[PDB]
């Protein structure tokens, strides 16, 4: 139909007038052009404005799997990555959720508390008498959670240091705890246990 061209000439008049593109999109919604057509128009709407992310965020608000794919692109290309933190957390593959968030903190960070619960609360529960004497005698006669805990402890304050250390212990981070402690009784005894299990008898 003819009516699109009336917006196209208007785009040729003044292409950086965002309200023109918005009204053009609105008409294509009201008539109901296909998803693959409206994608081409939204990508034009972005490409004429490739220096600013806000129009990408409107596009994502319409593309809402392709919205996750383009969101991975927009995270590769930081407030929108902060807006992505709830979606990214649900992926559970910790490198993919955490790397974009730490990049956004590098180019700032608001994920620093949700991901901490992703260590002690989310990851840790799943990643964690005469029998003991028998096991000891048998011995005598013969780490994503850890990384998450280390990341949390990298910028943790002094009050949460003990909690971070405890989380490291629950992550079976014997080597990490042994290294960090080399720099409360429970923390000292946890470092003891890391040394004892790692087989560092002379230091133990």
């Amino acid at each position: 139909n003819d009516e699109d061209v009336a917006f196209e000439y208007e785009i040729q008049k003044t292409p950086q007038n965002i309200l023109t593109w918005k009204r053009y999109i609105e008409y294509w919604k009201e008539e109901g052009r296909t998803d693959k057509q409206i994608r081409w128009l939204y990508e034009r709407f972005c490409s004429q404005f490739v220096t600013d992310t806000s129009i990408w965020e409107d596009y994502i608000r319409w593309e809402s799997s392709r919205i996750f794919w383009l969101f991975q692109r927009c995270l590769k290309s930081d407030r929108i990555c902060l807006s992505y933190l709830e979606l990214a957390i649900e992926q559970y593959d910790l490198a993919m959720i955490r790397h974009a968030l730490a990049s956004s903190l590098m180019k700032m960070r608001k994920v620093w508390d949700p991901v901490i619960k992703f260590v002690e609360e989310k990851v840790l529960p799943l990643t964690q008498e005469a029998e003991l004497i028998n096991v000891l005698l048998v011995k005598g006669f013969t780490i994503w959670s850890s990384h998450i805990l280390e990341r949390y402890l990298k910028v943790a304050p002094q009050q949460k240091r003990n909690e971070s250390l405890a989380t490291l212990a629950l992550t079976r981070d014997n080597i990490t705890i042994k290294s960090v402690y080399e720099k409360p009784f429970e923390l000292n005894f946890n470092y003891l246990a890391s040394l004892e299990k790692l087989g560092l008898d002379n230091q133990y």
Binding site: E8, Y9, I11, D93, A95, H99, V123, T127, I143, W144
Partner: peptide, 28 residues
């Protein structure tokens, strides 16, 4: 980056324009 890659941690973490139509509108 969110730290640096290491294999023991990686394995556990993984096992968890206007010109697009402007000229056409100049002849159509």
């Amino acid at each position: 980056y969110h730290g640096k890659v290491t294999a023991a941690l990686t394995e556990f973490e993984a096992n968890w324009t206007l010109a697009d139509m402007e000229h056409w509108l100049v002849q159509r």
